[PDB]
């Protein structure tokens, strides 16, 4: 029994011919979905509670994990890295444009102050 | 053995201090907490036997 | 591997024969009987259902053991209302009595002006 169990742990005696039941009987699709989605839904909690994802993209990726899109933890982590790298560019360009507009409005207000000092 | 709903309408005995519980046929549209009135000069609404 | 056996002659798996299995100090799995579960008292006829908090949920023939601490709450309508009923009935009684006083003084003003 121990030698046979060691062979099954190595992966032997598990061909196509020695399967006498269906795949749903051997490893259930519901149990596979439960394990898969529990891991893919608590990795987002470990990210959100610590540092990584914000409040708003958490719900979007939560619904996208509830849908059958993300296969496993590796490509889920890669998609989170892709959204983070896109969000960094989308906030960097917005901050540069906001800095340019803020300096322009400050220059316009200071020119208004100069004309106010020249009038009075 | 009945498709019509039964309504447990509790009353108050006018003669002795005791709440009397009766079993009415539930009219359509009544709800729990509605003051079901009963008597001669009761105003005509759904549920008021008169 | 030690297949265990009943201790009474109640040979059927009824509701009163609700059991468990424990381990003796003499190294033997024994078949020990369990009292049926007692539910806590609930509120009075019209609120959202939910067991009242702070009452020892036992059988009522076990409630003779209990003192006057583990059967009620010190509040008025303690072991009968879940205190949401209390804070609603107090406000309802007060508002209906005050509005009947308003209707009574309106009728008194109608008596004085008619």
């Amino acid at each position: 029994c121990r030698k046979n169990t060691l062979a099954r742990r190595k992966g032997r005696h598990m061909g196509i011919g020695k399967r006498k039941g269906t795949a749903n009987a051997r490893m259930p699709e519901k149990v596979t979905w439960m394990r898969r989605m529990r891991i893919l839904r608590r990795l987002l909690r470990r990210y959100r509670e610590s540092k990584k994802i914000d409040r708003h993209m958490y719900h979007s990726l939560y619904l996208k994990v509830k849908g059958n899109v993300f296969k496993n933890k590796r490509i889920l982590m890669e998609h989170i890295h892709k959204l983070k790298a896109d969000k960094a560019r989308k906030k960097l360009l917005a901050d540069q444009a906001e800095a340019r507009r803020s300096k322009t409005k400050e220059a316009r207000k200071r020119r208004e102050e100069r004309l106010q000092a020249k009038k009075e | 053995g009945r498709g019509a709903p039964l309504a447990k309408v509790v009353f108050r005995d006018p003669y002795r201090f005791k709440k009397r519980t009766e079993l009415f046929i539930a009219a359509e549209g009544i709800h729990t907490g509605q003051f079901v009135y009963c008597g001669k000069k009761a105003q005509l609404n759904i549920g008021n036997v008169l | 591997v030690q297949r265990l056996t009943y201790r009474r002659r109640l040979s059927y798996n009824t509701a009163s024969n609700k059991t468990r299995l424990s381990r003796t100090p003499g190294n033997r799995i024994v078949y020990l009987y369990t009292k049926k579960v007692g539910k806590a008292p609930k509120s009075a006829c019209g609120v959202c259902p939910g067991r009242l908090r702070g009452v020892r949920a036992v059988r009522p023939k076990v409630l003779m053991r209990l003192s006057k601490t583990k059967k009620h709450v010190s509040r008025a309508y303690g072991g009968s209302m879940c205190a949401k009923c209390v804070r609603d009935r107090i406000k309802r009684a007060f508002l209906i009595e005050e509005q009947k006083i308003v209707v009574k003084v309106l009728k008194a003003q109608a008596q004085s002006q008619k």
Binding site: - | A26, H31, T32 | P49
Partner: protein
Amino acid sequence: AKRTKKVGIVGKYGTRYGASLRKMVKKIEISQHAKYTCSFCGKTKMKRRAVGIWHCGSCMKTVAGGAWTYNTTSAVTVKSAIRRLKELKDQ
């Protein structure tokens, strides 16, 4: 994905008891299994109790409704007639 195109909820039965009978049972099964908007708490928690009885989930206010819907059109007509005879010339 749209898995059934005609049977809808009646596909739990299958091939039996006629297309017209299944079509006539379909609408009232949707009516008895659809949640209704509660007129008291404003939610949509009208859970179906036994026949004639409807029950909202929040605030536990049980209402005596129709056998398969929340309001019968005949019942709305009766309610309109009862309020009309109520406010008709003060009895």
